[PDB]
């Protein structure tokens, strides 16, 4: 995963 991902609470 080159691009960052995360839990859905990070972005709207």
């Amino acid at each position, epitope marked *: 995963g*080159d*691009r*960052a991902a995360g*839990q*859905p*609470a990070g*972005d709207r």
Partner: antibody, heavy 119, light 113 residues
Framework: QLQQSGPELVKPGASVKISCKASGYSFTGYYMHWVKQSHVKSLEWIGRIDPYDGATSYNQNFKDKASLTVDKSSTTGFMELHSLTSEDSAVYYC??????????????WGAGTTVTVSS | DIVMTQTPLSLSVTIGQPASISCKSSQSLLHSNGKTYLNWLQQRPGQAPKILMYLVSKLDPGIPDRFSGSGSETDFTLKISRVEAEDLGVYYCLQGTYYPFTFGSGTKLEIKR
């Protein structure tokens, strides 16, 4: 893997800028979040920033208070706080949203920066 | 934002005895993709927070097996099989389903010796 700046004393109304030095991993590959700790029971999420392009997602409470910038050259993330009041005195952590077992969580935390707002 | 309630507020457990921490959310933390983004943190005094579990039950590889987590959509429980001395500190739950992130009140754990 995360180094933060030293404690700061700020006068009410002034601004402060604290840094989060990253090392040992792909800097542009993980979000970097910031957390405010007012006291032992108060833990609040400030926002996150994508180090690849500088995309910042903030919490609505910290829209006019905090602003997240990044420096890919030094692989360092910064948080600036504007127009500080007494309620801004807290400890500020930076954390990395890492990857493991196909899931994301905060696996690396900075030591924390103590910010005291006083005249 | 989602409100997290942790019970009890303080807890005192003897070494080798089980412990149990509860965390309740205002809304169901189940997301559209079917994952329940609940995280458990531990902050020893004088240190930064550290995530113990993610997605209710998945442990961090550095965390021993005596920590376990079991919860439904709204109610969650963090269990310690045999409490050891290093397990002191304040424990927070953290939801990651709905923006923004919100932490719990925290549960202070004292080691009884």
């Amino acid at each position: 893997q995360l180094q933060q700046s030293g404690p700061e004393l700020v006068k009410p109304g002034a601004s402060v800028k604290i840094s989060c030095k990253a090392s040992g991993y792909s800097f542009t590959g993980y979000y970097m979040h910031w957390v405010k700790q007012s006291h032992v029971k108060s833990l609040e999420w400030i926002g996150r920033i994508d180090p690849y392009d500088g995309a910042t997602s903030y919490n609505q409470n910290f829209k006019d208070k905090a602003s997240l910038t990044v420096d890919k050259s030094s692989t360092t993330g910064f948080m600036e706080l504007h127009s500080l009041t007494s309620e801004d005195s807290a400890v500020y952590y930076c954390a990395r949203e890492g990857h493991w077992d196909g899931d994301w969580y905060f696996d690396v935390w900075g030591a924390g920066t103590t910010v005291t707002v006083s005249s | 934002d989602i409100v997290m309630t942790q019970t009890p507020l303080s807890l005192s457990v003897t070494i080798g005895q089980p412990a149990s921490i509860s965390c309740k959310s205002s809304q169901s933390l189940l997301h559209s993709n079917g994952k329940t983004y609940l995280n458990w943190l531990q902050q020893r005094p004088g240190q930064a927070p550290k995530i113990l579990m993610y997605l209710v039950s998945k442990l961090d590889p550095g965390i021993p097996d005596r920590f376990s987590g079991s919860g439904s959509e709204t109610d969650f429980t963090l269990k310690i099989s045999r409490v050891e001395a290093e397990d002191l500190g304040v424990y927070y739950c953290l939801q990651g389903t709905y923006y923004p992130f919100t932490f719990g009140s925290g549960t202070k754990l004292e080691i009884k010796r």
